[PDB]
Amino acid sequence: ARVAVLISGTGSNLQALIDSTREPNSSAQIDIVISNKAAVAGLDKAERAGIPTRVINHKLYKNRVEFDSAIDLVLEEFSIDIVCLAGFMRILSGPFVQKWNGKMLNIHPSLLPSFKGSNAHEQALETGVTVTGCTVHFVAEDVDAGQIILQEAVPVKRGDTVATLSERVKLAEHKIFPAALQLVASGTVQLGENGKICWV
Numbered sequence: 544a545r546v547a548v549l550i551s552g553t554g555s556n557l558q559a560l561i562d563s564t565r566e567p568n569s570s571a572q573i574d575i576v577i578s579n580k581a582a583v584a585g586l587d588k589a590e591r592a593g594i595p596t597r598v599i600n601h602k603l604y605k606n607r608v609e610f611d612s613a614i615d616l617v618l619e620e621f622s623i624d625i626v627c628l629a630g631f632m633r634i635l636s637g638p639f640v641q642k643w644n645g646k647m648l649n650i651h652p653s654l655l656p657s658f659k660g661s662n663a664h665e666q667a668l669e670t671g672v673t674v675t676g677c678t679v680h681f682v683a684e685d686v687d688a689g690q691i692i693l694q695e696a697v698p699v700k701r702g703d704t705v706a707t708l709s710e711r712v713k714l715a716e717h718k719i720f721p722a723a724l725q726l727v728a729s730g731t732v733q734l735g736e737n738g739k740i741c742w743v
């Protein structure tokens with residue numbers, strides 16, 4: 544299966560996906576990395592790995608639909624089967640999500656359905672949980688509400704900050720996102736006709 548990874552930043556999840564998809568038994572290959580932001584470290588990681596990159600600046604487009612159309616054009620150019628959102632921080636439009644339904648994965652640094660949104664660690668710390676984690680899910684129109692594929696719990700330690708908690712949770716992210724991608728790319732897991740997750 545042919546994979547696009549979309550990013551907005553550092554790209555540690557991208558790097559874990561690059562490493563995993565290059566193992567001999569990988570059912571996924573990463574054929575393009577798309578960033579909505581120029582000059583981010585994730586683009587360096589892609590170039591270093593010999594993977595093509597494109598920057599599609601959302602601030603140059605009139606609305607969300609035009610931006611998504613620009614993304615979609617590149618996805619078609621590279622005959623992409625699966626899209627991974629790996630620190631990509633834009634909400635995708637309904638029609639784009641529907642087109643890629645069952646074919647687009649997102650990583651989120653909480654145990655969904657807790658702490659939906661952009662600042663999950665801040666929320667976790669404010670709430671005072673002692674267990675948080677991360678989630679890979681299929682992308683649905685409703686943000687952070689799509690079908691869950693894998694999750695991993697991560698403890699919150701006394702005195703944690705966003706810096707230390709996000710660091711600990713990223714260790715888990717780098718495990719479950721490659722695992723989830725392999726499950727979907729191998730056809731082991733799919734979004735069922737009833738919309739629920741199906742293990743074949």
Ligand SMILES: Nc1nc2[nH]c(CCCCCCCC(=O)N[C@@H](CCC(=O)O)C(=O)O)cc2c(=O)[nH]1
Nearest residue numbers: 628631632633634635649661682683684685686687
């Ligand atoms: N349809 C849909 N789009 C998705 N994108 C992402 C990937 C994760 C996106 C989380 C971004 C939230 C922070 C943010 O900046 N959101 C808006 C602006 C709202 C605001 O600034 O308060 C935006 O930038 O488009 C996941 C996901 C999903 O499950 N469903």
Ligand SMILES: NCC(=O)N[C@@H]1O[C@H](COP(=O)([O-])[O-])[C@@H](O)[C@H]1O
Nearest residue numbers: 552553554555556629630650651652
């Ligand atoms: N709402 C989505 C979200 O919060 N994504 C989070 O952004 C970080 C990106 O790190 P990276 O650029 O090093 O992969 C990751 O922690 C990811 O789960």
